[PDB]
Amino acid sequence: SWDKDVYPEPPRRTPAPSPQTSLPNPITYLTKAFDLLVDRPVTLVREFIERQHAKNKYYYYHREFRRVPDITECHEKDVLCMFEAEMQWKRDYKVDQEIVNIIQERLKACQQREGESHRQNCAKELQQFTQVVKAYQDRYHDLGAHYSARKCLAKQKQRMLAERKATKEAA
Amino acid sequence: MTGRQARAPLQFLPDEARSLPPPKLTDPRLAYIGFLGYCSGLIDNAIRRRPVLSAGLHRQFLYITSFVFVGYYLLKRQDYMYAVRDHDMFSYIKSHPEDFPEKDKKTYREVFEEFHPVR
Secondary structure (H helix, E strand, O other), X not given: OOOOOOOOOOOOOOOOOOOOOOOOOHHHHHHHHHHHHHHHHHHHHHHHHHHHHOOOOOOOOOOOOOOOOXXXXXXXXXXXXXXXXXXXXXXXXXXXXXXXXXXXXXXXXHHHHHOOOOOOOOHHHHHHHHHHHHHHHHHOOOOOOOOOOHHHHHHHHHHHHHHHHHHHHHO | OOOOOOXXXXXXXXXXXXXXXXXXXXXXXXXXXXXXXXXXXXXXXXXXXXXXXXXXXXXXXXXXXXXXXXXXXHHHHHHHHHHHHHHHHHHHHHHOOOOOOOOOOOOOOOOOOOOOOOO
């Protein structure tokens, strides 16, 4: 399963079709035949397989980590500090890429659910998409292929120093 | 680089080399020397037209023994030379505190670099 609050779904809206005239309705007979020829046997097969699964019990756990301190607390060379620092940063980088993947899947799903009126009830998700992706464009973008962690902190210092000069001019 | 206490006879290994641990048997370098001796014996049977992998097993065993013996003594000399090099280096480190200062390990909270983005 999945949380309904990270992959959100609006509530369902489904009409009840009122037939004006009486031919009637080939697809209703065909979907009842579909139910009787497909829906029952696959349900019986899945129920058998689920009983065979629930005879025994496996479990897999989620791997979790700790917070090794910083790269801002590591010294000149000290390779057994920078190692834990940059692996912690690289795992943050992977999980942040997947944050961007989740938001972009939400944008795709808002496109396909809301139909031929795109701009109704997709303003909020496009807003948060441009927000998180503006953060990504600011934070990880223009460093290249040989990122380790140190070019990211150099970009951090250079950007906040440039904005410090900008707000000094704005003072 | 020369003496280094030039009393210094020809002295293939001093008595001070019996303080460092000797090289173990079946260390990989003397095993490589034994393989090189076995290849030497194989190719010695190949120089003259006697058959290879036969007819020279006393010469095979002599070559392996001679190379492993000589390489054992040369490895003991290698260990002595590296030990006296490190001992002299650390004695000079301890004997002169002025020229080798403690460097200020400024952490990356306050060490500035250039960035130069690859666009």
